[PDB]
Symmetry: D2
Subunit: 259 residues, 4 copies
């Protein structure tokens, strides 16, 4: 099956930022034809730790910017929703509606996304056990969702630290396609946080174990990003990472267990 790569800047800092990242993602989509690329960016960071942190430029501006990326590069789109009313307007441009980690249990939000007819990708809550995502998928199917993804992004391990229990990949694969969030899994919640040095090794682990796609927030200059500055992957490094995981996936694939 075509490998999925969801990538883009964490937040829609500006329409210019999106087009710049979109251009590179488009270039990579032309090279890696065996990969299905989906451009990602949030119109709002609704769960920042501090009230003083950057949130965004609003839904309207965000949807408009994402539409430009889709029209200019012909790339599929994904963004996250935070409250039920946002599903409808967002569904106008988003091919995949993303459900934030902390909201993976909010029934109305999941139902709102499912009835749009769009694909739905749920970030697995840091408090959730792998086997408990079965009911999350059940809610989505109940709501009309036909294309469902579950994204592994770490589990609470002590304070301000997340661990990736790779046993979750084959467990969740029992009821949905699985995506591995390479940048969210190395963040240190309320750290100041994150450790970029572990992004690559863990993504290699993900593809060796076996998943249906990877999720990576990428920015031209992570050091200057307005959100997740400690975990976003430098755009210049995206190509090499993708080539590497495709190579590891190929050699490991014959050993992937059947569900």
């Amino acid at each position: 099956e075509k490998f999925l790569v969801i990538a883009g800047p964490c937040a829609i800092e500006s329409e210019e930022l999106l087009l710049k990242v979109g251009e590179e993602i488009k270039r990579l989509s032309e090279k890696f034809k065996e990969v299905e690329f989906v451009f990602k960016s949030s119109f709002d960071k609704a769960n920042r730790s501090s009230i003083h942190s950057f949130r965004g430029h609003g839904l309207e501006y965000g949807v408009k910017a994402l539409r430009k990326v889709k029209e200019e590069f012909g790339l599929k789109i994904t963004t996250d929703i935070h409250e039920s009313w946002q599903a409808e307007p967002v569904a106008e441009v988003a091919d995949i509606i993303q459900i934030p980690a902390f909201l993976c249990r909010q029934t109305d939000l999941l139902l709102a996304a499912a009835k749009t007819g769009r694909a739905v990708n749920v970030k697995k809550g840091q408090f959730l056990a792998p086997w408990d995502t079965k009911n999350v998928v059940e809610k989505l199917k109940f709501g009309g969702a036909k294309e469902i993804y579950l994204t592994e992004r770490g589990t609470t391990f002590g304070y301000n630290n997340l661990v990736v229990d790779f046993r979750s990949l084959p467990i969740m694969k029992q009821w949905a396609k699985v995506i591995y969030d390479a940048t969210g899994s190395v963040q240190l919640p309320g750290g100041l946080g994150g450790m970029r040095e572990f992004i690559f090794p863990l993504i290699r682990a993900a593809v060796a174990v076996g998943c249906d796609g990877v999720f990576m927030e990428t920015h031209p200059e992570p050091e200057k990003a307005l959100s997740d500055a400690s975990t976003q992957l430098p755009l210049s490094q995206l190509e090499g990472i993708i080539e590497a995981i495709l190579e590891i996936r190929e050699v490991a694939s014959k050993y992937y267990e059947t569900i």
Copy 2:
């Protein structure tokens, strides 16, 4: 004064709310030292299963809660799940409760603060004690003056919550702290036998109040049936924690 927030997990009917409210009223008269706040949810918006009980709706719930406040003169608290609900709920709720999974949702917190009511945030199972400082800051920015942080356990491996009591003195630096005695012993995705021992610990350590979901017949509850405290055991636990608090309070750190 010491705060005691109690009531059935969900508003299964205003009939249930009236039976529990009657008991809460009686204790309210017996323990004048304590401030009682009646609690119940008009919607269980985060059930694991799509087939579980959610409730009878916001309107039916506000009506029922309104009846309790009018029939017993008790303060009220209920939780909201999306920003638009803050305004209508603030009509009856003296304290607006923010669910644990939603403790980081800026708009929900701001919407609760805008109502001018007191706000009680359930500390997420994913949050470290010191990270609640920012939660308080958001509420203050939104105009909230009476802010509470409720300890309800922290993720400890899978399907288990542990109570790190170091959180009580840490959170007290920026807000009044409440201890959720029934939620802290639940096993996500609980053990009633640990409710009393841990609530005794909470008052020995020092808190500003306790939170307890209570039902006449927990086993018959439509939500949190495994952790809700039988209504008949409430008086005994309250008298017990008041006695322990009386003695231990001498040592609560400044």
Copy 3:
């Protein structure tokens, strides 16, 4: 039942240190007649993180120093063993043989302690669940132990941090007398560690929940201690702490659940 208070300097830094702490413990034993005091100190710190840290002055010197405390003040004694051969010599002076946390599963060590006829106190391993101490008690009884204690000293919570799950107290009480380690429970393993500011609040929690005794490492000047300098309680504060827990125990006692 008489409340147990096990206290003393973490390590036998010198015979002079022991006698100084012993004098104060003796004074407190005369005041708090309802308490059973047991003087504690290790002749060897066999599990230090660094090879350069203080270990001790040997078993011989240690036993001799402890014997002096017992002869001079008439106080019961306890110290820990690290290998089976140490049980016999140590049993000559120790009323209670302590089993280190990391060694709570070492069958031969537990058996060696049990056959001495002395009481045995096992520090619960940071990796052990409360219900798994049932087999630890079974091993000790199998080995001849008639007086057994289980000591709560925290559980691994993420890296370099320990949490105290107070549910362990009533669980372990099902098969043995329970002791709460007030100083070990606030240490940050490999922290540099520990947080002395939490010693008092947590010990209050312990007695409110209900335990059979408390364990506290105390030193005249913790800041200058050769081991556990970040968690040992200043000797001057011991009296107040004991009075406080006795008061809280009394008021909470009528509510202690029956096993």
Copy 4:
């Protein structure tokens, strides 16, 4: 060269050791690129239950292991539990293994190092990756030149271990790293279905070798019966990790 440490958890008999050793020898001939080390314990000194199988003693175990090395020319490794055992075990053991619970016992580590043999320390379930630096330092101080650190999972809530793969690159800073594929999936006080997926992850991340307890009939094993890999599946897993390593090694960080 890449290291593969494998053998039955316990020396249930030298008869068992010979059957497994025969298979390990065959793979040794098939995979010349890999260095095989036969492993088995002469004593399970940390069983949860006093009524569980421990073994036939040190002497019987050393004898059995001695037979494997002589009959197959395979290197040997076994674990010690108390300092006095280092010397007698060093007679046959090329690598002395230190149990996870005992990774902080200074005298045991020093005794292992004094023998002049290589030392492999199982990382305690209570240890953070960076704290193994001090473990290595103790061994170096004791005269050890060939030092290995084995990842075998970390305490995650109760009766569960999680493998934090960030540990591999962190520990590689001061020692050769081995991944225990069978111990990492056990549930203290396991799931065989996760052995292969996680070992694939280990080689994709990058390690210096793998550790696997294997038995002809795991279900009939006297120890770790729930995690031991069936002997017949060993060749397939080895070929698989060698292929993955061949491709992924290009990306192992310096």
